[model samples]
Target: GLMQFTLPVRLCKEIELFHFDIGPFENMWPGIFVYMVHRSCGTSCFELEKLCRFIMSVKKNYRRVPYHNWKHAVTVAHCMYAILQNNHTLFTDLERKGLLIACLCHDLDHRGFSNSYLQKFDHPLAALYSTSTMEQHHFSQTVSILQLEGHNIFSTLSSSEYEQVLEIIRKAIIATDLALYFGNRKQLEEMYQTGSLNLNNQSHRDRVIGLMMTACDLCSVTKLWPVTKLTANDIYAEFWAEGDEMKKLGIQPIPMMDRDKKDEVPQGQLGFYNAVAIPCYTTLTQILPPTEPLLKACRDNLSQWEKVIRGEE
Candidate 1:
């Protein structure tokens, strides 16, 4: 109960506990949900309070005008929290804790754009992690912060044990990067659907951490229609904007969106979601029935959007 957090890297070295203030609530207030996350992850009051402080402080930066901010962190954490709560049979306490903590710290220092842009700009944060991990550094620094103060939570963990913590954090956070989606699930499912499953060591951690976070990352497609309607519209416009840039640069545009008059591609994407994303989420709901209403909401949104694209809605 009497613990705190700190940053290990010299880059954001000024990060101290008192620099920010926050609350931990499991019963109310999403921001305060950090408390619930901490408890779920086996974190003590002091340890989680420290993590909550960090998430709270980091939200103040205005990355882009009226755009990307810590709300995504809050949302993803909430999503992952729901997944872990529902899928407790598929994970251990340690795994659940790692995933929860990982989700919270996943986008700790994100820029407005995605990883592709971050790689292209040669961002120093990218350079600092060079071919190893950008997400790991953030996660480790979070752990390091706890260690920097040398307190109840992290002090109890040894160096090797701490590395295990880092590994779990990395797997969950990396899975959130959209580029990993196609290959990641295939790889994990290959193992899952194959014979002789050995869910021990990092291999076990990897399998569970990968699928759950990947699910958590793209889980928005399974939200309530009201939420997804607003969100998908934003994404549709943003993807179209990206495609517009690609056309100007003469680069073959990535299919994250379409920019045609009436944009049938984006329209088709919604229909495809009706057929594909909705079904995948249906299976997900079989395992997580609490998410059914949410998934149904998204399906409803997609169906309505399909109608709009057809000029009927």
Candidate 2:
């Protein structure tokens, strides 16, 4: 409310409906973010204005990479926001706040390369974190930006609340790494299958939040057909760039990353939908039935991918 940012009313109304595209929605991020933070945490007017400043700073820190840029972050944050809108009663206010903030910062400063690429090429960040390399960098970069002048939105939070929020933020951001998905996947699937998921238990709750973070991170997979196709191309364009680099370096790139194998894109999409995206959304719907729409939407997109893979599209 104390900033230069404002989400267009039309976009705000349609974001949850999945009727919008990225260009106009990009500038709308700060406004949407401010509104969510205000509703979720009740930031004071002064603190909110500072949070707005932090939003400005964070958006500025993003590099103009092919995909993993500020726009992607905005989409991820919006996905998290939409999930929270439907399921806020499922989480404490603190859990909602942490998930939203982590989504916003999950891919900060991405350079259009995978963590494996970084490690293979001997980047310093790989050595720094030793595991979950990109995820760790992303979260650390988020904290670094918050420490900058005029960017500490948590300043108004109580000391304990602040610490709790950061801890949640830490786990949620790292949870974005697909490498960490298996443990979360097994745990959630087991809990759902055994009817053992007790949200009243703190560990159970944290597990849910972690899987929810992954679900939101890949939210494009669960978008409308046209939007899903376009977003997939945007993502692969980044992968192609990295593959080009690997080629230049005399290294073989993964098929999904190789531009020459462009036709493989459909097959890759099909596998991702079958192996990862659909399962993630399905698991989510088990505990949060309101998210069944996400599972349905994802299956709808996978059908489209299947058509193309079969040379039917």
Candidate 3:
């Protein structure tokens, strides 16, 4: 419906999508997406009007939850933008386009609840998919938007190209489900350790892309201290909301999700960094040395979390 939309000229010039500190321009996310697509995919690849409509529709579809909202989507997309900007030679043009769009729409229509929560409540979404329920729904919602009139950003793509990009988007979105990350990470680590990671190999490249999706999805941990702390709080806020719901149903919430155990946040953060963030980023850096900054940020944040847990912050 926002077909006539056009961002202000001032914003168009100011949005550096390649920069990590683009969070301050949260209100101008649509403009950022428009600029990013035009620059990366080019005007010939996408219609301006359709792209605008698609971005707006994606933004509108995101629920106003604490963490999995429009802001988080844009942040993840921006991370992809920055990565692609610096490592353009590492991926095909179509792959770059698909990855950016997938990051933006990865959490579309998120209900602010974990997959386990949905399964626990016997949600219809859970029934529709036995595993990775929310991720499958997110991919479906992305496809639904593409099917809408004036929302097909990939309209200029050939039939085969369109199908391929959709497949890339689907795989990238599903990879954001952490359930798959452990297995993916193990394979990736083995490939790197054995020096068998050849990007020329389709399977190896797909694993790399999958890991990248997870890295961007959790990019908040790679931000500066203040931003990282703020993002973590928002995440826990969403988790605690679900915890409260579980409590009303006489279900005991995990310590990480329990608001009454707020003091445990620092400890939980340490555990998360150790178990998920650090190792994931470590393997990523091994394959993509350019992404060492992301690993450094994660380690820096881990130390901050440690300081807090030690009452030294």
Minimal lDDT window, size 10, model 2: 16-25
> What lDDT tens digits, residue by residue, belong to model 3 across residues 85-204?
758678897898799899999999998999988988888999999998999999999999999988988887899999999999999999999999999999999888888889999888
Query: Would you list the C-alpha lDDT of every candidate in the order shown?
Result: 0.54, 0.81, 0.86
Question: What is the C-alpha lDDT profile of model 2 across 1-313, one tens digit per residue?
Answer: 4343345677556765533344554755677777666655555533765777878878987899867988888778777777777775777767776777788889998998998788878899988899999999999999998799888877877999989989999999988999888789889999889898898998987888888888888888887788788888889989999899888778999999999999778888888998899889888888888878778888899888888877888
Evaluated at residue 6, the lDDT of candidate 1 is 28
In the range 38-138, model 1's lDDT, one tens digit per residue, is: 54464452355455555544444323322233544555666676666555576665566566667666766544445554455566666776543455555
Give the lDDT of residue 284 in candidate 3.
85
Q: Candidate 2: misplaced stretches above 4 Å? A: 1-9, 18-25, 43-46
The whole-model C-alpha lDDT of candidate 3 against the native structure comes to: 0.86
What does candidate 3 score on TM?
0.93
Candidate 1 TM-score, true structure as reference: 0.69
Ranking by lDDT: 3, 2, 1
Residue pairs in candidate 1 whose N, alpha carbon or C atoms collide under 3 angstroms: 6-145, 225-297
- Which residue pairs clash in candidate 2? none
Q: Candidate 1 vs candidate 3: which has greater TM-score? A: 3
